[PDB]
Amino acid sequence: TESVKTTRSKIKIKDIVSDVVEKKANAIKYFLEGEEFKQAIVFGAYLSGSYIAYSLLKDCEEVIIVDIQPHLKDILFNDGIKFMDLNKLQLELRNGTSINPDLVIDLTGIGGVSPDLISKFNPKVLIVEDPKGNHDKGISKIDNTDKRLCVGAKKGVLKTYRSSKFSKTSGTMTLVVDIIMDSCREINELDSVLYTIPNLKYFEGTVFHEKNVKKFLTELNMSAITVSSIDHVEYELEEILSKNISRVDSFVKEFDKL
Amino acid sequence: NYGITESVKTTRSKIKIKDIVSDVVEKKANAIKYFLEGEEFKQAIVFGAYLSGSYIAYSLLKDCEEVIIVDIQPHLKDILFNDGIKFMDLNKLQLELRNGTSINPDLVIDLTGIGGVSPDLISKFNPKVLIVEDPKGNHDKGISKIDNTDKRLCVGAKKGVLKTYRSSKFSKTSGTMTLVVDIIMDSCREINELDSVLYTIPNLKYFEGTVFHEKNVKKFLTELNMSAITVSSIDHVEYELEEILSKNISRVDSFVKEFDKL
Amino acid sequence: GITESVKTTRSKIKIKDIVSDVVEKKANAIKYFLEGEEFKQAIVFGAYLSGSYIAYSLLKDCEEVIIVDIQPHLKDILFNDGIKFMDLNKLQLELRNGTSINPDLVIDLTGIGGVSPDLISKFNPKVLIVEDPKGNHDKGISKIDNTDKRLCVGAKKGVLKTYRSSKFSKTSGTMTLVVDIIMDSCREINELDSVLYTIPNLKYFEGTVFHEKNVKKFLTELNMSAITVSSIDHVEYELEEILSKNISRVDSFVKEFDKL
Amino acid sequence: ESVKTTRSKIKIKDIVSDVVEKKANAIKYFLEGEEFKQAIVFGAYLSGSYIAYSLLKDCEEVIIVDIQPHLKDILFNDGIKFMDLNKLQLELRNGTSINPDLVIDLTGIGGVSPDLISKFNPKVLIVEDPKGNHDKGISKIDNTDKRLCVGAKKGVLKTYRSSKFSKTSGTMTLVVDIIMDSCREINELDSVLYTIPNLKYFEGTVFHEKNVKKFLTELNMSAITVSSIDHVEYELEEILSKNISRVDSFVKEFDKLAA
Numbered sequence A: 001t002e003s004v005k006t007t008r009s010k011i012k013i014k015d016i017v018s019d020v021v022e023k024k025a026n027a028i029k030y031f032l033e034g035e036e037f038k039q040a041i042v043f044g045a046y047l048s049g050s051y052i053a054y055s056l057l058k059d060c061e062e063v064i065i066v067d068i069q070p071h072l073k074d075i076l077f078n079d080g081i082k083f084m085d086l087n088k089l090q091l092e093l094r095n096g097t098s099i100n101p102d103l104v105i106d107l108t109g110i111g112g113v114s115p116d117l118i119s120k121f122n123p124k125v126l127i128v129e130d131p132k133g134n135h136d137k138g139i140s141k142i143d144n145t146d147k148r149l150c151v152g153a154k155k156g157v158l159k160t161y162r163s164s165k166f167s168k169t170s171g172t173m174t175l176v177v178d179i180i181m182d183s184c185r186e187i188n189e190l191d192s193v194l195y196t197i198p199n200l201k202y203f204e205g206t207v208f209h210e211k212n213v214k215k216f217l218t219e220l221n222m223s224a225i226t227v228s229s230i231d232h233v234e235y236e237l238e239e240i241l242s243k244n245i246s247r248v249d250s251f252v253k254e255f256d257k258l
Numbered sequence B: 001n002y003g004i005t006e007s008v009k010t011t012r013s014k015i016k017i018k019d020i021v022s023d024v025v026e027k028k029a030n031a032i033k034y035f036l037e038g039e040e041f042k043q044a045i046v047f048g049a050y051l052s053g054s055y056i057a058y059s060l061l062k063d064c065e066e067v068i069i070v071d072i073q074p075h076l077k078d079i080l081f082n083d084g085i086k087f088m089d090l091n092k093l094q095l096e097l098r099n100g101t102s103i104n105p106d107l108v109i110d111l112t113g114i115g116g117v118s119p120d121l122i123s124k125f126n127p128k129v130l131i132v133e134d135p136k137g138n139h140d141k142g143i144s145k146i147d148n149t150d151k152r153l154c155v156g157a158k159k160g161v162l163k164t165y166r167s168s169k170f171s172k173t174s175g176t177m178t179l180v181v182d183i184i185m186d187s188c189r190e191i192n193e194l195d196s197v198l199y200t201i202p203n204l205k206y207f208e209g210t211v212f213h214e215k216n217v218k219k220f221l222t223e224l225n226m227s228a229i230t231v232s233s234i235d236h237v238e239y240e241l242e243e244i245l246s247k248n249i250s251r252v253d254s255f256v257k258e259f260d261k262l
Numbered sequence C: 001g002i003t004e005s006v007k008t009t010r011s012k013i014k015i016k017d018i019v020s021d022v023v024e025k026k027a028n029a030i031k032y033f034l035e036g037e038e039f040k041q042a043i044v045f046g047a048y049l050s051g052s053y054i055a056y057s058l059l060k061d062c063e064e065v066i067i068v069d070i071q072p073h074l075k076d077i078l079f080n081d082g083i084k085f086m087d088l089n090k091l092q093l094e095l096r097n098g099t100s101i102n103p104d105l106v107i108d109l110t111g112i113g114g115v116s117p118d119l120i121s122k123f124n125p126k127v128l129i130v131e132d133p134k135g136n137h138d139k140g141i142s143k144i145d146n147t148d149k150r151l152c153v154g155a156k157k158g159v160l161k162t163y164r165s166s167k168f169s170k171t172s173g174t175m176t177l178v179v180d181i182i183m184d185s186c187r188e189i190n191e192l193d194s195v196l197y198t199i200p201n202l203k204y205f206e207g208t209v210f211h212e213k214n215v216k217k218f219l220t221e222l223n224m225s226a227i228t229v230s231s232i233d234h235v236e237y238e239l240e241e242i243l244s245k246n247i248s249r250v251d252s253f254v255k256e257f258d259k260l
Numbered sequence D: 001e002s003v004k005t006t007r008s009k010i011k012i013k014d015i016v017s018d019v020v021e022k023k024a025n026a027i028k029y030f031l032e033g034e035e036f037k038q039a040i041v042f043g044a045y046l047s048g049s050y051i052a053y054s055l056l057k058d059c060e061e062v063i064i065v066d067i068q069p070h071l072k073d074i075l076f077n078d079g080i081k082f083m084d085l086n087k088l089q090l091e092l093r094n095g096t097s098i099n100p101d102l103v104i105d106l107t108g109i110g111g112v113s114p115d116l117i118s119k120f121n122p123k124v125l126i127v128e129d130p131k132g133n134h135d136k137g138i139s140k141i142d143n144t145d146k147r148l149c150v151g152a153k154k155g156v157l158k159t160y161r162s163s164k165f166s167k168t169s170g171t172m173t174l175v176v177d178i179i180m181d182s183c184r185e186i187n188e189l190d191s192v193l194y195t196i197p198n199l200k201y202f203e204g205t206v207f208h209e210k211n212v213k214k215f216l217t218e219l220n221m222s223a224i225t226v227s228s229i230d231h232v233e234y235e236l237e238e239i240l241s242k243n244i245s246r247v248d249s250f251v252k253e254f255d256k257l258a259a
């Protein structure tokens, strides 16, 4: 009825994803200190990998994205980035001399790249993304980030957290879901709000089970939250979401190896 | 049953959104049944087909000779699943009340909530029993001001107010879909704290959009036919996933509070 | 704090200020419901915690205001000599054996396990107000509650209800609402950047009032900051804003119970 | 038909005890039974006292160092030698009695300087990381990594609450957070009318009033008081125990090939 207002946030799921991936890319940029590289290899195209690889094009002569899933070539939006499936990278490493990266970035996280494969490189810089967020015994047990930091003259660990808030992982998707969930809880406590609905679904399923990157990108193109209320809440909805997005802090911690 | 790799498990809850909706609607229908104490009626009029109205009207067929659902939205006739229930849009009800003699209900149930039926329309009836659903959940100044439940309780020899809350939990309204959303949201919060869980996703969307803007009841019913929650974790969580959701569904308590009058 | 790198900030808002705001809202809700009517004799059951101020607020329009409490030591919580204090035993004996008790205004603030509908039924006042101890829905609490059974006399009847708008509270009790405001405020303050920890200055207040039977000590315990925060950056503004916003959410009103 | 008042059997001191014991066991596990001639622990409050006591078994001499002389009162074993910071610094410059093989820094934020730590050459150095979950302000003032500047074997003592948010690893903070989270859950139990934690600014008693005895008395109180219609004793203790069990303390070895 006209007694109740329906408000869809201006902030879309893709905007939250964008903000998180840009923070991760800037954390890497800052850590690299403008160094130029002949060949950068980034493992893991989903979800921040695509933009991170794009961000390296400026200072890297060649940027290669490596993924175990060949269909993830569809998540790359720049033809300047070379895509290689994991099997073709492993074959080229053994049979050729074209793979000799000076910059290696592992964004695979839990159950990802093996320290054995990383050990085959001798880069100037190695960055490994730490998938751990706040403390969880099970996640900490399966994590092997420290074992992956086994090569490179300069080593760094990319860490991403939500300041003053709890998140189980540093994964782009998890952080976006957590921002939306925390925002809903606070929005629901605003005076006059009847209900608050997050626009969420199992996005990872669209990418990895349905193998449909286009459909996944379409799914991100929608308001993060829908609110039903008696009073106007547009500024409040924006204040809460924006504050939760601003809490994301990404940085590369240098791992000293003398 | 896996995620990005085989090191992570993806678990979809066995409980679907429709199962939660069903549990809530059934509690509201049982609260009305209990209040009516088996009384038989010649003509029952239920205002508001979405969301619990459809099942509530169906539940009255046993003791009511004629059951009529009234809705301001004509397309909501599509949410009725029993041909025994008569549907009338609000305009047809108003005109037949003013110009005919076929509308004289002995049982009136108002489930419209906020911005719904007017006390003026309710005042045109002289039923044996009047039940008005209170849309208010936990206290909210804004919601309490627009609410006029007490003004709608203006006719009937026996009067009752249908109230629905989540025991020891916070909900802004008693609306079926608000309660379902809140059960899922609170369940996600708790599931996320289970050891080894990476993330928890509630399968939610603006369901009111499908029903009132797209005017698609079939699509809405299809949207309810899916897992309430999807969890990404390192260890098995199936047991906890169903237990947490079930515990939250069980907190729903619906009852008709009798409004004393002569 | 432990070093000069950490700041310790005590809220300017004291526990007593929160109590004051809540009791005043309950008294104003009753005032607006009474619509300026004058009474010869008002009887208020339950001195702790809002009862004392509510009885004081009735002095303007009531010739005689009597506070009745089952605990005789609660005469100490009254701050105005104009209010008559009567223990429950004397009231019950006076009702049965005398003619001095015939109130035109009766207010029951005892809540759960309080005054019986049988005692209320002995009065024939112009106005009866019963405080509803229920806050948000709880099956266990709704089962023991008998507010509706207590609203059995009076030409005009009302139920005093108190909630925190958009927040969760199990009861409408003054001290519980204060505790809940402080607890919710701590949770939000802890999430401010640079905060190390947030401590609510709370204790078992009823122990002082009802077990130690020391009203003065209890009043001293309320005379202290509601929250203490340890942080790296200044948080004074946010600390007061969060607490003030939570206090503002308290809403008290008397719902008239129609009886033609 | 009656309102019940229940005080938790678990006292604030029991929660403090459980946290300090986890920190001491994390250090024990990391030391792998190694024996030391002289251990120096910086920071007596709050876990320092018990940690120093726990080192007595494998260390010939255990010394607690604190910038506050009145903190000698928090030591419960006469076998631990107390030294104020000025007396340690004096003995380092003018004497030869201070040459620890085990150094443990538990001072946290605004504590011991890396310059003082650099004066030692121990077999093992352990620095407690005061950071809990991420906070920009706390991360900026923290200098734990700069303090890991000596020792053949280096470790960082980390303490968190599994699946729960805490701003620091400080014993006090963790106890407060366990009680606060427990109250929040207890309040949602059916029939509960109210839940009150017994909390106050304990640090003020120790550092401003300089009264360790009064502080210890303040910990000897039930953590929570609950008012309810139904019995909740079992659930009260279960929620508190489950929150205490979430505390996880461990020493993460800080690899340094040169040392």
Ligand SMILES: Nc1ncnc2c1ncn2[C@@H]1O[C@H](CSCC[C@H](N)C(=O)O)[C@@H](O)[C@H]1O
Pocket (backbone or CB within 6 Å): A043, A044, A045, A046, A047, A048, A049, A066, A067, A068, A069, A072, A086, A107, A108, A109, A111, A112, A113, A114, A129, A170, A171, A172, A173, B004, B005
């Ligand atoms: N061994 C391997 N080599 C290359 N890519 C891998 C891999 N194992 C997993 N991947 C890929 O790495 C990604 C894991 S998901 C990583 C999420 C990312 N850290 C973020 O925050 O957005 C997926 O694209 C997956 O297909």
Ligand SMILES: Nc1ncnc2c1ncn2[C@@H]1O[C@H](CSCC[C@H](N)C(=O)O)[C@@H](O)[C@H]1O
Pocket (backbone or CB within 6 Å): A001, B047, B048, B049, B050, B051, B052, B053, B070, B071, B072, B073, B076, B090, B111, B112, B113, B115, B116, B117, B118, B133, B174, B175, B176, B177
């Ligand atoms: N004046 C009126 N007369 C009849 N139906 C109305 C109305 N105003 C609104 N409605 C209908 O009443 C419903 C309002 S939504 C009610 C939600 C319901 N109480 C529940 O808990 O599920 C919608 O079906 C709407 O179309």
Ligand SMILES: Nc1ncnc2c1ncn2[C@@H]1O[C@H](CSCC[C@H](N)C(=O)O)[C@@H](O)[C@H]1O
Pocket (backbone or CB within 6 Å): C045, C046, C047, C048, C049, C050, C051, C068, C069, C070, C071, C074, C088, C109, C110, C111, C113, C114, C115, C116, C131, C172, C173, C174, C175
């Ligand atoms: N039968 C009875 N008659 C009179 N006073 C009673 C009573 N039973 C309990 N009391 C008193 O009533 C108070 C109950 S506590 C009431 C709290 C109050 N509603 C508030 O919000 O502040 C106590 O003072 C208690 O001693």
Ligand SMILES: Nc1ncnc2c1ncn2[C@@H]1O[C@H](CSCC[C@H](N)C(=O)O)[C@@H](O)[C@H]1O
Pocket (backbone or CB within 6 Å): C002, C003, D042, D043, D044, D045, D046, D047, D048, D065, D066, D067, D068, D071, D085, D106, D107, D108, D110, D111, D112, D113, D128, D169, D170, D171, D172
């Ligand atoms: N430079 C210094 N040298 C020695 N002790 C210090 C110091 N600076 C602070 N301290 C002491 O170190 C302690 C800081 S509080 C440390 C809390 C502890 N990590 C816990 O979790 O319980 C206090 O006892 C303080 O007096």
Ligand code: NA
Pocket (backbone or CB within 6 Å): A140, A141, A142, A143, A144
């Ligand atoms: Na591990």
